[PDB]
Every structure is written in C-alpha cells, then in structure tokens.
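Honest question from a wet-lab person: if I give you the sequences of every part of a complex, can you actually get the arrangement of the whole thing, not just the pieces? Trying it with mine:
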Amino acid sequence: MRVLLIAGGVSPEHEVSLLSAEGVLRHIPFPTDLAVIAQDGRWLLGEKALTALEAKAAPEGEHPFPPPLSWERYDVVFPLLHGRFGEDGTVQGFLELLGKPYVGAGVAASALCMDKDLSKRVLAQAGVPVVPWVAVRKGEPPVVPFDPPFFVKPANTGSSVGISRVERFQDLEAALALAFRYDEKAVVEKALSPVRELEVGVLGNVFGEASPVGEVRELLIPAPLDPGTQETVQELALKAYKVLGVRGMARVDFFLAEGELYLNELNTIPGFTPTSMYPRLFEAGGVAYPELLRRLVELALT
Amino acid sequence: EMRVLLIAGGVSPEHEVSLLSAEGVLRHIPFPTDLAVIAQDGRWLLGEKALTALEAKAAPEGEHPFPPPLSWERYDVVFPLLHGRFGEDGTVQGFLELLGKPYVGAGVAASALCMDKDLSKRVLAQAGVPVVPWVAVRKGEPPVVPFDPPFFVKPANTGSSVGISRVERFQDLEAALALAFRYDEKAVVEKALSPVRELEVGVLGNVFGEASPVGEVRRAELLIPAPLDPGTQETVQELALKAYKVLGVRGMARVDFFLAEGELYLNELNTIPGFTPTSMYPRLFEAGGVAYPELLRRLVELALTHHHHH
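Yes, you can. This is the full assembly:
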C-alpha cells in the first residue's frame, strides 16, 4: 500500500501546505513519498521534494504539469493543497482521470464547497442556516438588501485574499473591485458582530461522524457551548456534509451570534499540522493523529 | 496562428455520440483543429489514429494512458466534446485548468453542478426556478419518498438515460433503486409527469448569455420554433438565462424543460450538448441567425475571452 502525498501549491497557502505535509509524513502509518508543487506551477519530485519541505518553501519547480511521476506505483494520493488548484476540484479531476483513489472530497464536493455562493444556495435550500448573502457578478452592479457591516469576498478564491470588511455602503464599490481582481463572482455577507467562531471536524464518506466542537478566540476544545447548541452544531455539520456529498473529511466552520447558528464554510483540505484545528478536534474525540491518517487513506479506497 | 484541440469519444456510454459530434464540428470549425480521441478503455488515440477512429465511429481501445503525450503548447483552445461522466462532470475541465489551457464550455463547478440532478435542482429551486419534485436517495440510507408513484428513478450523475426506470408501484422501487446504484452512489427519485412536452433552449455566452428560439421534441421531430403561446416562449427563455446565470455557466448550454399541461418545469442543463450539424443545439441557434460555423467561432472566442481577460 504505497501512498503519494502532494503538498505546496500555487495558492497563498503554499507555506502552510508544506507544514501540514511535515506532520502527516511523521505519523502516517503507510509508506509515503512526497511530491511538491512549487509556487510557479512546476513540480518537484524525489529528494528534490524533500529538499523543498525542509526549507518550508519552494519558489520554483523543475517539471511542468503534468510531471513525469510513476502513478502506478501508488495506491492512494493525498492531495494536501489548500485553496485554488487544491480544494477546488482541479487536482481532483486530474486524479480521477489518472484513475487513482485519493483522499478528500471529489470534484463536485470540492468545487461546491469552494464556491461561497453556490454552497450557501445548496445549504439554504436543504434547511441549513447560513449567513445572509448576495452574489455580485463582475459588470453587474450589486443589489444588497441588508445594511453594513458587510464582508465582501471572492466566491472561489479562498485563502482570505481579496476579502473586505465593509463598514459603509459607499465603500462597497471599492470592495467589489478588489474582489473582482481574483474572481469573476463575489459574495456580500452580512457581518455578524459580535460573533463567536465555532469549528467542528467531520470524518467519513458522505455519512460522517462529527468531532467535538472547537472554538477560536487560542482554540478551546471542547468549546464552551450549552449542550443544545453543541448537538445542533454537530447535526448541521453532518447534514451539510451529507447534502454536499463530501468524502474523506471536512472542517465545518460556524458562526454563533445572539444564540443563532450560521454555517460559514466547509473546508475540504483543512490545516494538518499536529497543532492545526482539524486533527486536534479529533484528538479530543479519541482519534489519534496517526489513526486519523489511516482512516483518511482507508476511506479513499472505498 | 490559432489552433484548436478537439477531444471526443470518452469512456461514458455516449462515446459514439461524441464521435458523431466531432465529425460534424471538424467539418465546419473555422480554425486549424487537431483531433484527440479518448477510447472506451480510457486510453488516448492521437494523430491519424484519432481520425481513423472517427471513421469507425467507435474506438474501444486506445494507445496512450492518461495523461496523453500531447504537445499542449501548440493548442490555444481545447474543445472538450465529451458527454457524460469524465467529460461533462468537471474532471477534464479541472485537468485543463491545471494545464493553463483555455477550453470551451462550462468550468469545473458549473459542469459538476449541472451534471448532478440532485444538486442542480437544489440550486435552481433555491433561485425560484421551477423543478419537478424530487428526493435524493444515497446508498444505505433507506428510501424516504414524499410522494406517490409514478416516479422516474435516475442516477444523480447519469450521462444519458442509463439506469433510469419509470416506477408505477412502490414494490418496484427497490429494483429501480438498484439499477441506478450500478452507475452512481447517489440517486434521485423525481415525480413522473404525464403527459409531457419536452422543450429545449440553447444559450450562448459567458454567464450572461443569449437564448435561442425554443424548440420542442416529439426518430424525434424538432419543432422550431415550438408551437407555444407567446408568453410561454419568453418565460422559457428567461428561465434558461437566469438558470444559466445562477449556475455560472460559460460558453454554452442546452437547457431542457418539461411542460406537463400548463405546468412548466426546468429539467436539466446540458453543458456539452450534441453537436452534429443536425443536433438540437446547432439547429436551435441556426434558427436564431447563427450559422453552424459562426456558432463554433463564437464558442472558441468565448473560451479565449474568459481565460485571458477574465
């Protein structure tokens, strides 16, 4: 059972992608070689990939995509890439055409969870509560039916680049301009204030099991929630996970404001440093970090 | 100095339809176009082997396993003329995104979404677009259907009418809910309408597209334009554009509608429709003042406008 791990990436989260790879390699129970996508698109293989990892960065690669990798040697690919060209279904489509079982969500689930607009429409239709939002498409002036403060975001960029907290309606045009530099579609979310940020991990194919609830202030595991709020968070995570058809894993971020929950975002490739939120959430749930990785590889083969 | 790579064939059950559309596109496309054929075994046929395959109308075996050893740098646009799974579902689109190669048609998210009968209905219903009542049934979770038979049972990501069965009584649901799970881990159970008129509309453009006249299906007769009350024609077109806009489709789509008696329902969006010179989507825009060569030209130009200027 040979496992391929892909890390790095062209996204602004290339640095944290290599840090997550360093953690998986140490504790993954399977033989695992490392391949790295440098920040210029070209890949690094072999010991050249290990060289990029021990340096925590890789600004330039050697082989253009697709690389001369021996895909038949591996049974599972672990795409540990964050954001565009990682969590958006492009890599997953290349792997589906390779015929390789891989860790994480499929093409549809990755692309949908990546789109902050289309994911909310699916969830809102399935009864899952989400933050009030409106999509704005480039060239089309916006109709925002709610008052500031807003969050203006590119719908498919991720990595929090191009996001604007908008306090005045007159600042909206400049916020959409900044977002449209990264995507053709933008979202305008009602900023909840004050608000608590809750995160929960899911593990499984479609029908998943929820981790304990965490809270971001440091990370409080378990979060100090009343027992009814805690169950509803885990219930809404598993429901969204099911409706969207996520496979492998997801970190489901929620907002809690005035006793009301709002699903914010599903992250299909969360941080995976032994100190990141997703693996620590399942630690407190009784799933050891190496055991978490075995479950991820085994779920790919099913 | 523009050159197009046309990919056709595919592993999906629509393999022969894809080749039939490639011949039609190759005959009239106004660009130097090289043809690549995906065989039914997933292996690629390149060069004159691809053209030879186009004459047999069926390439079950291929020579090169994925990825094909093509010189991607000699192609400015890829035209994925593949139908169904591993063609319309976003996989090939995502590979072409990673290549930095402009391509015709819907992107990754729109292709995966429009192919999922369950998820596209959820987005369209959330937008107000009318859809036939349905329920998703996943492998294991027992079937909880909120309505009574008759109901069609489909795979959620079916290429074209593979594993679909009309169910007149609930006793036959389990057998129907097993021919569908041979092709997809998720199924849909839609309320069967009777009687139904099938209406189809072509859309062209990136996100904000233009609609063709509406046609009707009854081999199969294509009534262009469809014998419809005048408000019903403009509603079907506006309902195709809004759906096109919400899903963020690029390049093209053939939006199919149901008409029971007076009740209008959007059925499914087809991001890579059939493209023989006589298929509905070319015939639709043919009646709209867009000749088949001009239709192909704008499709190629719409791919270049998005990748280089958007």
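Two things worth pointing out. The domain at 1-104 of chain A is CATH 3.40.50.20 (Rossmann fold). The interface with chain B takes residues 41, 65-66, 85, 88-94, 96-99, 107-108, 111-112, 114-115, 118, 121-122, 124-126, 137-140, 156, 184-185, 206-207, 242-245 of chain A (CB under 8 Å).
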